[PDB]
Amino acid sequence: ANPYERGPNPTDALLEARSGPFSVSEENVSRLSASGFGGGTIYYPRENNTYGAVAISPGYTGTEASIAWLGERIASHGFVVITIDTITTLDQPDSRAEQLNAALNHMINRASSTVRSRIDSSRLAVMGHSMGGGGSLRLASQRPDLKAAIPLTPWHLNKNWSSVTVPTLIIGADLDTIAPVATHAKPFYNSLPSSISKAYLELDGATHFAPNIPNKIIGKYSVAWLKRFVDNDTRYTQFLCPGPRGLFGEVEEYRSTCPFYP
């Protein structure tokens, strides 16, 4: 009944694997071609269909190489995904929000027909690492039409995200000393409205750079979140609700507003 379902029925194994079930191709976006961001790489399913589209930003000093693994992995579960470079590696979070917006527009309107035809432009999401995660929150606050936001070890000077209504999964890292969960991730999660679809997943034994290092937990829960909200795919609710709420060695804590009005 759900026209947006893609791919085989999921399992924990299928979601933890290095690659999902979709073969993936890439399209480079040069800095020349990009308007309002620094270029990047668009990963997309070889199999023709329409999919949701996702823009991912790196963090301060970061390049697309630091998030490439995640772009490719998410695309391999049935999404069109752009990992961007920013105008400069030192851009601040609200600038990164604008750049995420520009990157979404690029995929929808300026990429090749191969890419553009694979996107349902009504089903979009944003993600980012650190300041890029801050950027994701800012854009989500501005764009209630977005289907999902996933701030990864996010950093932002503004802690109050009570304006955000986009389904938001925040992933924190317990040992983060750059964007400590006590002063960034948790304040953000707690200020998001209680009324929205949201979750907080804190990684156990993780530094600030966990999102830059191929990680089965980040991969599994990012894909499950995008599936549930970008694709309305309730086959993925099972992974999120009740969710992994002291899987020690993997997940320090998990909070949510499950079950998200099934």
From Swiss-Prot:
One Gene Ontology cellular component annotation held by this UniProt entry: extracellular region
Catalytic reaction annotation: pentanoate ester + H2O = pentanoate + an aliphatic alcohol + H(+); an octanoate ester + H2O = an aliphatic alcohol + octanoate + H(+); decanoate ester + H2O = decanoate + an aliphatic alcohol + H(+); a dodecanoate ester + H2O = an aliphatic alcohol + dodecanoate + H(+)
pH effect summary: Optimum pH is 8. Optimum pH is 6.0-6.5. Optimum pH is 7.5.
Compartments in which it is found: Secreted; Periplasm
Annotated effect of mutating G62A: Increases activity on poly(ethylene terephthalate) (PET)
Practical applications: Has potential for application in biological recycling of plastic waste products. Shows promising applications in the laundry industry as a cleansing agent, as it is thermostable and tolerant to surfactants and organic solvents. Also shows promising applications in ethyl alcohol distillery processes as it may be utilized for treatment of molasses wastewater.
EC class of the enzyme, as a word: hydrolase
Function: Catalyzes the hydrolysis of cutin, a polyester that forms the structure of plant cuticle. Shows esterase activity towards p-nitrophenol-linked aliphatic esters (pNP-aliphatic esters). Also hydrolyzes the triglycerides triacetin, tributyrin, tricaprin, and trilaurin, with a preference for short-chain substrates. Hydrolyzes the hemicellulose xylan. Capable of degrading the plastic poly(ethylene terephthalate) (PET), the most abundant polyester plastic in the world. Can also depolymerize poly(epsilon-caprolactone) (PCL), a synthetic aliphatic biodegradable polyester.
Protein name, UniProt field: Cutinase cut2
